[PDB]
Amino acid sequence: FVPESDGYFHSAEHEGSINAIMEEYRSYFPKWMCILNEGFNILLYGLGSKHQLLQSFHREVLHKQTVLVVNGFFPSLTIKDMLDSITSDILDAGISPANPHEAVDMIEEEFALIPETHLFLIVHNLDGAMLRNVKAQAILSRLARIPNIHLLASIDHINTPLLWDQGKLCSFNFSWWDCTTMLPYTNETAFENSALSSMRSVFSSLTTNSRGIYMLIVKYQLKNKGMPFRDLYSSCREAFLVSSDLALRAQLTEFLDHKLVKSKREQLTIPIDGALLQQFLEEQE
Amino acid sequence: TPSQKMKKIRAGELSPSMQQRTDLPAKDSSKSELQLAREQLHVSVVPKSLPCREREFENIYAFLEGKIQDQCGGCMYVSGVPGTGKTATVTGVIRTLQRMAKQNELPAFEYLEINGMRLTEPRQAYVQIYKQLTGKTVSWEQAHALLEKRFTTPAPRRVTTVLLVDELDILCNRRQDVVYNLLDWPTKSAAKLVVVTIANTMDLPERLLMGKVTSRLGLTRLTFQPYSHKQLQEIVTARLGGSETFKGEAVQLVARKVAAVSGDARRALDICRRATEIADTAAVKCVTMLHVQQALAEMIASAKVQAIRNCSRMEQIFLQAIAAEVTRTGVEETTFMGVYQQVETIAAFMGVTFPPPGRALRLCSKLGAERLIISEHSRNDLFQKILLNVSADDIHYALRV
Amino acid sequence: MDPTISVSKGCFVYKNGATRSLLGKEVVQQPFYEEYRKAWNQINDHIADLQHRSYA
Amino acid sequence: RNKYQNARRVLNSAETQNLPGRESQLQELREFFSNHLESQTSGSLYVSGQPGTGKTACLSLLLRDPDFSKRLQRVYINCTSIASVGAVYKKLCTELQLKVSGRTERDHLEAIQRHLKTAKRMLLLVLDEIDQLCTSRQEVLYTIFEWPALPGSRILLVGIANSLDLTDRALMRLNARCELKPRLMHFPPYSKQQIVEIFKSRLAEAEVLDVFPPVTLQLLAAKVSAISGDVRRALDIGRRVVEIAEQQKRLKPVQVTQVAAVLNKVYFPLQQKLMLCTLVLMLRNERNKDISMGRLHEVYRRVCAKRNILALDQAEFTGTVDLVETRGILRIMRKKEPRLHKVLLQWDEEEVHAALSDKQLIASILSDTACL
DNA sequence: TTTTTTTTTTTTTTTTTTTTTTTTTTTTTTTTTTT
DNA sequence: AAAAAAAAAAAAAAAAAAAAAAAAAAAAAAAAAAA
Ligand SMILES: Nc1ncnc2c1ncn2[C@@H]1O[C@H](COP(=O)(O)OP(=O)(O)OP(=O)(O)O)[C@@H](O)[C@H]1O
Ligand SMILES: Nc1ncnc2c1ncn2[C@@H]1O[C@H](COP(=O)(O)OP(=O)(O)OP(=O)(O)O)[C@@H](O)[C@H]1O
Ligand SMILES: [Mg+2]
Ligand SMILES: [Mg+2]
């Protein structure tokens, strides 16, 4: 891959092949154990999802050693959670200190006391959504530098080595492997990190006066193709649809909560185009 | 040992005593009539029957008597600006109900009371409610558990309990679990709990309470309107009794000049006490109108002209020049450098020499200490922003007239 | 979609006798691993000797 | 004693046995419970609705059902009763009589997970007010809603809240798996006739039906069903009508004028008058509505000096505007200095003109542009 | 051997610090006009 | 094709409340003193 700079300045058979690919990567496991024995760490950089390959490595090979699987594609993990996991569950040493580098210091001084107790560390998506800062990669590089801890990892983002300098890459004694499966990212894109019908469904739940306030907003937006607060308050007090100002303010706040009215500074727009508002007004008559 | 004494304190077995005087207090027969008026006009001396609050007394009395007699439980919210007789009327209602219960005209009941501003956290309401039942001081988790075991479980014969909650806005926070718990326990049939909640703002249930808490709070509400000049005169002439110590026009002046500002009853009963103290040192036995005029000038203070007149000469030149920079630039917020340029212009006109900008910064800090101007920390000299806290017409009223 | 992936947890522990020489005897007693270990230990001691002699 | 106090007692706004407005919802919940009992499969459920619509009353009526009492283990947890979000495991261990080693929340979680792994009866965990468990990470709520996916676990849980889309907004990750996303059940607000039937059931519970003719019930329900639709406000106005009519008439049925007066009831000092008039004048004559306290005080002083009334200084004026804030006419945005506090009028000007009721003074102040 | 005294650890409770929310204001980028 | 300016959206303070960590005080078990 030798990219050209001029592009920047001018601006079935498949399942059998995937099974053969997965068997070919399954053959690599004794060589991976021999490589992990010499102090190197395994890194996989293929195209597709490498969750099943690392799960097969943990199942078929590491069925008796201490293993900390870390799902880095989880949108809500913290480095404190992994450090507390190591400290409390593996070493039985309680909760880790609040500064993470002191926690890695204590993990090094405690793992230096116990040789022949290897901790395997399997980080799916080392470039995950909450591991993309410099601090978590410094913590993981200090963890992988320990001779007792052996690390396997996967990377998928193309800008992954931008956060590894030469010191982190010297601590991460990586052995790079092209484990290119063609499996789709089912698990990795399932999480939170990656409308007319909703408007009708939340409009059926409102009461009568709430519907009337929203119909006043719809009629004003359809006549003028964001309405002020004073015209809405005058039209609500004319039809006796509200008692005072504060009930209307709370009702419009409820409208902001269910994504029906968007407030701007009081300008109250509906984020729906005019033809759909016309069909919606014909739906209510 | 004091640790055993504190373990007795948490158990509620030792009374929190206060020191007693070595000398016996003064007798009532030695007091002058001005002294009797000054001790009757105190705000701590509540009457047994409050004037001009008869309708609110009838409303709260009918509410609490009905909730006691039906043995059902519910809630109320009374409101009004401070000084309008809310807590005095509620405790007068509850004292009348306890006098009826001691005469077996009403079923007997328990009366717990808390205050939102006497607590360091809103969670301490559980500690202070449970302390008034048993006497024990516990943690708020155990007190919450014991209050839930008291209110949610049916146990005949449970007595009716009336919980007055002053300062309801302090018990609100973001989570709103304390106010939800206090207003949710009357909804259970096992708890014969009647909650009265006192606060200042009328629209507290819709402003900062949630929807379910406003639903539980109900709509049976009362508002205490501020005192007019007729009512606020009736209060003071009730406190004086049949004495002729106050002139009839003096109390009218106090009521007319306090009712126009706030409607507070403490304000009138403090201005009348200050007028009595003025009449005492003037060696007269009556409180005429000019004593009330001097007391009204003292209590409703306006002492910014006196501060500008007693500023030094360089301070007054600085105060003229800040107003000159406001007039020149148009905006109200001025930097120090343009103020110092106008300072040197005005000092060159007036014939004086001015101190250098360091001592001018000392003058600016000295005026900002009195809050005559608003100024920053002097670490950013020549670029700090100088608001003028006094109005520009008070400076020209003080330095010309 | 699997039991291994959870919606709440992010880290999973499989502790087997953890308290407070990875491979087996079948490869360590082989001659190629012994000669590899011996050659690597010689070369690593030689490079450490050279770096200490350069820094002294 | 008489019919009025009997009606005031029997409305009661408290826990009941009959629920005439909730018949399809109770049958649907019974069908959900019976279909998950007969297949012995676990299932989540999230019921929601406006406050006062009948959710807790329904799921407290169903946690006293004797057949579901014999077939499964019922647990009710109100979630404002917990000291923290992570204490729900401690509360559930206390409600299930589990034995823990103790003194960490993770061990309580492990004890609950072991109690779900084995079983002898099905578990029904009702978490009422489940919006109180929502946090930043939501480890607790995602841990709880994953228990139907746990292998061999038989817990079927119900979460009650007010928000229509709490499972969509605060439980986004549950949509990724069809095993995990809870079945939804909305409790719609009450209509007019449902509130009428609730009143006619509560009044026939103690045979006090003669106090309310049908016309006033059909007016009170017509207002309350249109305003909010909850039954707590309906029963509160229905109790307040009788407790006002007992004060008024001391057997007279309550008239339409009494409930109309109570329904329109539910649904000044001189310096505060002069403050409100200058705020209306400053908002009428100027298009910049960012009024500070000092800029308002300067116009107030000239308006007072024009009428030859002695004006307050800034220190009493701040307290005066603070007292007008309590009535709801204003809202004071707080800043670092009291001169720079921002007054925001929160009534329209006709409400101020009707509330001050001193139009001879109001028309005199609004015509004086020159003092601004 | 059995009762009492003093130590250490652990547990709970309170206080302080850090992190999060939440409101307001500022700065940067966008859309629309002008050359 | 490129400049500008009126407004909208990203961000930047900040300020106010809460989550969590630290620190201290009270309680349960331990080990020694002693009758
Ligand atoms: N109608 C009245 N007649 C006689 N004295 C009154 C009257 N109203 C108030 N007072 C006196 O003024 C004081 C008012 O204190 P009170 O407890 O009534 O304040 P409040 O109205 O509850 O308001 P807040 O507690 O919010 O300040 C009392 O000490 C009482 O002696
Ligand atoms: N269908 C009904 N028939 C008779 N009474 C009812 C009905 N629904 C509710 N109520 C009564 O009205 C009150 C409403 O309280 P409920 O337990 O329904 O609150 P909720 O709907 O859970 O509101 P929130 O979610 O705000 O607590 C209850 O005391 C109940 O007795
Ligand atoms: Mg009070
Ligand atoms: Mg409920």
Nearest to D121 by CA among D155, D77, D76, D159: D155
Helix axis angle for D231-249 and D192-204, nearest 10°, is 50
Neighbours of B99 (CB within 10 A): 11
C-alpha–C-alpha distance, residues B114 and B163, integer Å: 8
Q: Do C8 and D143 touch (CB under 8 A)?
A: yes
CB neighbours of residue D154 within 10 Å: 22
Chain B environment of D314 (Cβ under 8 Å):
304, 389
The token pair at A160 is 């992954």
In the three-class reduction of DSSP (H, G, I as helix; E, B as strand; rest coil), residue A42 is classed as strand
Phi, psi of D124 (to 5 degrees): -115, 105
Q: Is B218 annotated as a binding residue?
A: no
Q: How many CB atoms lie within 10 A of CB D196?
A: 22
How far is D21 from D237, CA to CA, in rounded Å? Answer: 18
Q: What are phi and psi of D157, to 5 degrees?
A: -115, 150
**Taking the C-alpha atoms of D6, D7, D10 and D14 in order, what is their torsion angle to the nearest 10 degrees?**
-130
Q: How many CA atoms lie within 13 A of B75 on its CB side?
A: 29
Range list of H helices, chain D: 3-11, 24-38, 55-61, 66-71, 88-96, 105-117, 139-144, 166-169, 192-204, 214-227, 231-249, 256-266, 270-285, 293-306, 314-325, 349-356, 359-366
Q: Which residues have CB under 8 Å from A198's CB, separation 6+? A: A259
* Per-residue b or e along D24-47, where b marks 16 or more CB atoms closer than 10 Å to that residue's CB: ebbeebeebbeebbeeeebbbbbb
Q: Which of D1, D42, D279 is nearest to D155 (CA)?
A: D42
* Radius of gyration (C-alpha) of chain B in whole angstroms: 29
Answer whether D228's CB lies under 8 Å from D187's CB.
Answer: no
Task: Tell me which amino acid residue B221 is.
Answer: R
- Residue B263: half-sphere exposure toward Cβ, Cα within 13 Å: 20
DSSP H helical ranges for A74-207: 79-85, 100-111, 134-144, 166-171, 196-203
Q: Helix D359-366 to helix D349-356 angle, to the nearest 10 degrees?
A: 130
- Which residue, among B81, B84, B85, has the nearest Cα to D322 in the 3D structure? B81
Q: Are B213 and D131 in contact, with CB atoms under 8 Å apart?
A: no
Nearest Cα to Cα of residue C12 among A105, A93, A22, A54: A54
Long-range contacts at B28-32 (CB < 8 A, ≥ 24 apart)? B32/B285
For the record, the structure tokens of C23 come out as 């491979």
Give buried/exposed letters for D337-348 (b at 16+ CB in 10 A, else e): ebbbbbbebbbe
Contact A43, A174 (CB under 8 A): yes
| Assigned fold of D23-187 | Rossmann fold (3.40.50)
Is the Cβ–Cβ distance between A41 and A152 less than 8 Å?
A: yes
What is B300-348 written as a DSSP string? S---SHHHHHTS-HHHHHHHHHHHHHHHHH-SS-EEHHHHHHHHHHHHH
Which of B271, B273, B11, B313 is CA-nearest to residue B136? Answer: B11
Decide: D234 and D198 in contact? Cβ < 8 Å.
yes
Residue C49 neighbours by CB under 8 Å, 6+ apart:
none
Chain mean position to CA B189: 37
**H helix count then E strand count, chain A:** 13, 7
With a 6 Å cutoff on the Cβ, whether D55 touches ligand 2 is yes
Q: Whose CA is nearest to atom 4 of ligand 2?
A: D19
What is the resolution of the experimental data for this entry, in Å?
3.2
Q: Using the structure block, give the residue that is written with the tokens 């979000």.
A: D85
Residues 15-54 (C) with a CB less than 8 A from some CB of A: 15-23, 27
CB atoms within 10 A of CB B352: 11
Rounded CA separation B254/B237 (Å): 11
CA distance D366 to D372: 11
Question: B277 is written with which tokens?
Answer: 């103290």
Residue B204 token pair: 């507290």
Q: How far is CA D224 from the centre of its chain?
A: 15
- Sheet-wide strand order for B373-374: B334-335, B385-388, B373-374
Burial readout B217-241 (b: 16 or more C-beta within 10 A, e: otherwise):
bbbbbbebebbbbebbbbbbbebbe
Positions of E strands within B128-233: 160-166, 193-199, 221-224
Beta bridge partners of residue B198, listed in sequence order: B78, B166
DSSP characters for D217-268? HHHHHHHHHHHT--HHHHHHHHHHHHHHHHHHH---PPPHHHHHHHHHHH--
- Angle at which helices B265-281 and B229-240 cross, to 10°: 50
Specify whether the CB–CB gap between B159 and B110 falls below 8 A: yes
SS3 per residue for B211-278: HHHHHHHCCCEEEECCCCHHHHHHHHHHHHCCCCCECHHHHHHHHHHHCCCCCCHHHHHHHHHHHHHH
**Burial readout B291-313 (b: 16 or more C-beta within 10 A, e: otherwise):** bbeebbeebbeeebbebbeebee
Tell the residue nearest (CA) to atom 29 of ligand 1: B43
Report CA(D19)–ligand 2 centroid distance (Å): 9
Could you write out the DSSP letters of every residue in C12-37? EE--SS-----S-HHHHTSHHHHHHH
Residue in chain C closest to D177 (alpha carbons) equals: C1
Distance in angstroms (rounded) separating the CA atoms of residues D144 and D152:
15
* Residue B109 · residue B160 · CB < 8 Å: yes
Q: For residue D20, what are the CA distances in angstroms to A251, D199, D229?
A: 29, 10, 15
- The answer to whether the Cβ–Cβ distance between C7 and D177 falls below 8 Å is yes
| CA distances (Å), origin C4, targets A183, B162, D150, D229 | 18, 55, 11, 46
C-alpha neighbours within 13 Å on the C-beta side of residue D265: 15
Q: Is the CB of D292 within 7 Å of strand E?
A: no
Alpha carbon of D354 to those of B47, D279, D344, D351: distances in Å?
36, 15, 19, 5
Same fold, D23-187 and D270-367: no
Phi, psi of D80 (to 5 degrees): -90, -5
SS3 D335: coil
Residue identified by tokens 């507290």 is B204
Q: Give yes or no for a contact between D85 and D74, defined as CB atoms under 8 angstroms apart.
A: no
Work out the minimum CA distance from A75 to partner chain D, whole angstroms.
9
Structure tokens at B252: 């009218």
CA B349 to C1' F2, in angstroms, rounded, equals 54
Task: Please say whether the beta carbons of D156 and D163 come within 8 A.
Answer: no
**What is the C-alpha to C-alpha distance for residues B345 and D167, in angstroms, rounded to an integer?**
70
Distance between CA atoms of B11 and D246, rounded to whole angstroms?
A: 46
Q: Token pair of D255, please?
A: 């008239």
Nearest CB to C8 within list D146, D151, D177: D146
Which residues, at least 6 apart from D59, have a Cβ–Cβ distance to it below 8 Å? D29, D47, D76, D126, D128, D158, D160
CB D42 within 8 A of CB D154: yes
The answer to whether the annotation marks D9 as part of a ligand binding site is: no
Closest Cα partner for B109 from B183, B173, B162?
B162
Q: Which amino acid is at D66?
A: P
Instruction: Give residue limits of the domains in chain D.
Output: 23-187, 270-367
- C-alpha distances (whole Å) from D189 to each of A43, A247, A252, B48, D51 are 57, 18, 19, 48, 9
The helix/strand/coil state of B76 is: strand
Say if the Cβ atoms of A76 and D164 lie within 8 Å.
no
Indicate the angle between helix axes D270-285 and D349-356, nearest 10 degrees: 160
Helix %, strand %, coil % of chain A (to 5)? 50, 10, 40
Q: Indicate the residue of D15, D298, D323 with minimum beta-carbon distance to B391.
A: D298
D333 CB neighbours strand E below 7 A: yes
Can you read off the two tokens belonging to residue A130?
A: 């909450």
Distant-in-sequence contacts of A258-262, Cβ < 8 A, 24+ apart:
A258/A202, A258/D164, A258/D165, A259/A195, A259/A198, A260/A199, A260/A202, A260/A203, A260/A214, A261/A214, A261/A217
What's the Å distance between residue A226 CA and nucleotide F4 C1'?
27
Which residue has 């309590």 as its token pair?
D326
List all residues whose CB is within 6 A of at least one atom of ligand 1.
B 43, 46-47, 50-53, 82-88, 200, 235, 265-266
Q: How many CA atoms lie within 13 A of B307 on its CB side?
A: 17
Exposure string of C3-36, with b = 16+ CB inside 10 Å and e = fewer, is: eebbbbbbbbbbeeebeeeeeeeeeeeeeeeeee
- Helix (H) or strand (E) segment spanning residue D161: strand D155-161
For the segment 50-89 of chain B, residues whose CB is within 7 A of strand F: none
DSSP states along D254-305? PPHHHHHHHHHHH---HHHHHHHHHHHHHHHH-S---EEHHHHHHHHHHHHH
Of B231, B149, B233, nearest to B191 by C-alpha is B149
Task: Judge whether A34 is closer than 8 Å to chain C, CB to CB.
Answer: yes
Please give the structure tokens belonging to residue D71. 């077939």
Q: Is B200 in contact with D326 (Cβ distance < 8 A)? A: yes
Strand order in the sheet with B74-80: B109-115, B160-166, B193-199, B74-80, B221-224
H/E run at residue B380 = none
Q: How many C-alpha atoms does A260 have within 13 Å on its Cβ side?
A: 25
Give the span between the Cα atoms of B274 and B292, in whole angstroms. Answer: 8
Do C6 and A74 form a contact (C-beta atoms < 8 A)? no
Q: Which of D283, B309, B329, B328 is nearest to B319 (CA)?
A: B309
DSSP B23: S
Provide the CB-side half-sphere exposure for D141 (13 A, CA): 29
B262 Cβ neighbours under 8 A, 6+ residues apart: B81, B83, B226, D269, D319, D320, D323
Nearest partner of A251 among A215, A197, A198, judged by Cα: A215
A-chain residue closest to D178, CA distance: A190
Q: Which nucleotide is nearest to A98 (CA to C1')?
A: F21
The integer distance in angstroms from the CA atom of A273 to the C1' atom of E32 is: 21
Q: Residue for token digits 């049939």? A: B189
Neighbours of D322 (CB within 10 A): 16
Contact A260, A254 (CB under 8 A): no
Q: In angstroms, rounded to a whole number, what is the distance separating the alpha carbons of residues B190 and D53? A: 22
* Residue D54 to residue D47: CA distance in whole angstroms: 11
D60 touches chain B (CB under 8 A): no
8 A C-beta contact, residue B260 and residue D271: yes
Indicate the SS3 state at residue B118.
helix
Our answer on whether the CB atom of D26 is closer than 6 Å to any ligand 2 atom is no
The answer to whether strand E lies under 7 Å from the CB of residue B380 is no
Q: Is B177 left (phi over 0), alpha (psi -120 to 50) or beta?
A: alpha
User: Side-chain half-sphere of B257: how many Cα atoms within 13 Å?
Assistant: 23
Nearest to D188 by CA among D28, D14, D15: D28
Class of D270-367 in CATH: mainly alpha
For residue D237, how far is the Cα from the chain centroid?
Answer: 16
Q: Is D60 in the pocket of ligand 2 (CB under 6 A)?
A: no
Spatial separation of the C-alpha atoms in residues A67 and A121, rounded to whole Å: 6
Measure the CA dihedral A5/A6/A7/A8, to 10°: 60
Distances in Å between the alpha carbon of B384 and those of B335, B374, D335? Answer: 6, 10, 18
With 0-12 / 13-18 / 19 or more C-beta atoms within 10 angstroms meaning exposed / middle / buried, residue A122 is buried
List, in order, residues 6 or more apart from D302 with CB less than 8 Å away.
D371
**Nearest-5° Cα angle at B236, B235 to B239:** 90
Query: Partners of B74 in the beta sheet?
Result: B194
State the Cα–Cα distance between residues A262 and A42, nearest whole angstrom: 50
Pairing of strands B74-80, D122-128: unpaired
| Separation in Å, CA of C14 to nearest CA in chain D | 15
Within a 10 A sphere around the Cβ of A120, how many other Cβ atoms?
Answer: 20
d(CA D331, CA A185): 52
Q: Which two tokens stand for residue D365?
A: 């102040």
Chains B & D: contacts with CB separation below 8 Å: 111
Element containing residue A24 per DSSP (H, E): helix A13-26
- For residues B174-195, b (16+ Cβ closer than 10 Å) or e, as one string? eebbbbbbbbbbbbbebbbbbb
CA-based R_g, chain C, Å? 21
CA distances from B104 to B99, B100, B101 (A): 9, 6, 5
Structure tokens at A104: 């890695």
* Site of tokens 């404190």: A80
Angular region, B14: left φ>0, alpha ψ -120 to 50, beta rest: beta
* Structure-token pair, residue B331: 């905006």
Hey, how many other C-beta atoms are within 10 angstroms of the C-beta on D118?
Answer: 9
